[PDB]
């Protein structure tokens, strides 16, 4: 026994059997994924090929022991519709001395980029409110749920903060209404309404996502049209 030849095809690094790497989605064609696989031997004391390589996302250079991203034609998209969270291939090492075959799994974990803005599911929003509505009432909840802004990214990159912006064509909209919690989007009445003074407000509503770095955050805006309906009471108010 000279063991110098059973040890071909094993790994000369440490850590887990699988070789795990993170890379950004929509990486450019040719991106290095694995620099060196760190397999003992010489692709001639061995030979290397790829199995389980669907859509040929990985190219192999055997001599270097180096995986490249095959991307010409298309983009590596993690977001819907594509949903490419990760790519798994096998690097097959045929040992050319003793005959062993070993499979070295490679798992590419594809990282989300803030490459998508919030998009309102409606072109515009609307509510009609009687003027007898009590101050403090939650007069609109439609930006909560799935009918407000939607952002197809992951985590903070896909999570929405709602605010009321100053409308110069309607300065009192943002003083009469408030979104007290930016993550809910609930709109609350701050001031008593008055049909006989103002019957309509155009409330400009902004949605930004919450990418960690503020320079990379994206935006959408819509209008919430509040019509005021005339209120009458048995008592002495209207």
């Amino acid at each position: 026994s000279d063991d110098w030849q059973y040890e071909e095809c094993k790994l000369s690094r440490t850590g887990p059997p699988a070789t795990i790497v993170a890379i950004d989605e929509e990486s450019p064609n040719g991106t290095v994924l694995v620099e060196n696989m760190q397999i003992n031997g010489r692709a001639r004391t061995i030979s290397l090929s790829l199995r389980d390589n669907y859509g040929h996302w990985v190219i192999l250079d055997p001599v270097k022991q180096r995986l490249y991203l095959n991307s010409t034609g298309r983009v590596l998209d993690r977001d819907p519709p594509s949903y490419i969270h990760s790519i798994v291939v096998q690097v097959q090492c045929t040992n050319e001395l003793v005959g062993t075959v070993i499979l070295h799994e490679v798992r590419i974990v594809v990282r989300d980029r803030n490459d998508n803005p919030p998009r309102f599911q409606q072109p515009r929003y609307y509510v009609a409110i009687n003027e007898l509505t009590p101050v403090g009432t939650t007069i609109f909840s439609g930006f909560s749920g799935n009918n407000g802004a939607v952002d197809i990214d992951d985590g903070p990159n896909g999570q929405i903060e709602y605010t009321i912006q100053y409308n110069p064509y309607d300065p009192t909209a943002n003083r009469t209404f408030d979104i007290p919690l930016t993550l809910s989007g609930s709109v609350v009445l701050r001031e008593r309404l008055n049909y006989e003074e103002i019957t309509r407000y155009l409330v400009i509503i902004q949605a930004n996502d919450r990418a960690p770095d503020p320079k990379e955050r994206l935006t959408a805006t819509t209008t919430l049209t509040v019509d005021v309906l005339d209120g009458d009471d048995l008592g002495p108010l209207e």
């Binding site: 094993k10 059997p17 070295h104 919450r210």
Partner: protein, 206 residues
């Protein structure tokens, strides 16, 4: 009020858990900063995630409920939550289950029997065993040997092919009971199994 933000590295890459991690172990501890200094409430989100992971609300200590098996699943997209008085922040963690060598080789097609004439030439192939092992890389590459070794038969280490070594003789030995060992090539903790091999010989008139 500004919302909380998670701080742990693994929202930025992945988190490695070995499949042998015992139930009740601490995987990790969620960390979050709130600009307002207020107290935070940590949790997990998702039907699947909650069955495997529990999260203590105040510390953000994640522990394992059910056991992990790399042979069933090697990836999980898990969602964690952290909450202040104004609402909930969620981020996803790519969890990778690291392989350990916890399976031994399984011999297939047993039992193994052979019937050959005593006048079988040296060099002749007379059987082939086969085994598999579900572990990754070295833990699932199998080597075959006889244990104890035989002066009359040998087995190829990688392919499991059995050949005649020396000339046979029915008048001396009409039958052999051999043991094949199948070992994985796991460097640290290698695992093995045994299969019987019955070589009966048939008589020529010589």
């Amino acid at each position: 009020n500004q919302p909380p933000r998670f701080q742990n590295y693994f929202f930025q890459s992945y988190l490695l858990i070995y499949e042998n991690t015992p139930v009740g172990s601490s995987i990790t501890q969620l960390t979050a900063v709130d600009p307002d200094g207020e107290p935070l409430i940590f949790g997990v989100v998702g039907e699947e995630a909650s069955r495997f992971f529990a999260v203590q609300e105040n510390t953000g200590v994640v522990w394992l409920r059910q056991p992990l098996d790399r042979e069933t699943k090697s990836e999980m997209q898990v969602v964690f939550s952290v909450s202040d008085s104004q609402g909930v922040v969620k981020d996803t963690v790519n969890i990778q289950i690291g392989d350990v060598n916890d399976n031994a080789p399984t011999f297939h097609n047993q039992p193994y029997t052979v019937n050959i004439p005593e006048d079988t030439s040296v060099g002749t192939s007379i059987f082939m065993v086969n085994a598999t092992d579900p572990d990754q890389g070295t833990g699932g590459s199998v080597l075959f040997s006889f244990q104890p070794p035989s002066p009359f038969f040998s087995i190829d280490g990688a392919r499991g092919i059995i050949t005649v070594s020396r000339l046979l003789d029915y008048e001396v030995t009409s039958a052999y009971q051999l043991t094949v060992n199948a070992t994985d090539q796991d460097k640290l903790h290698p695992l093995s199994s045994l299969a019987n091999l019955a070589i009966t010989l048939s008589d020529i008139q010589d």
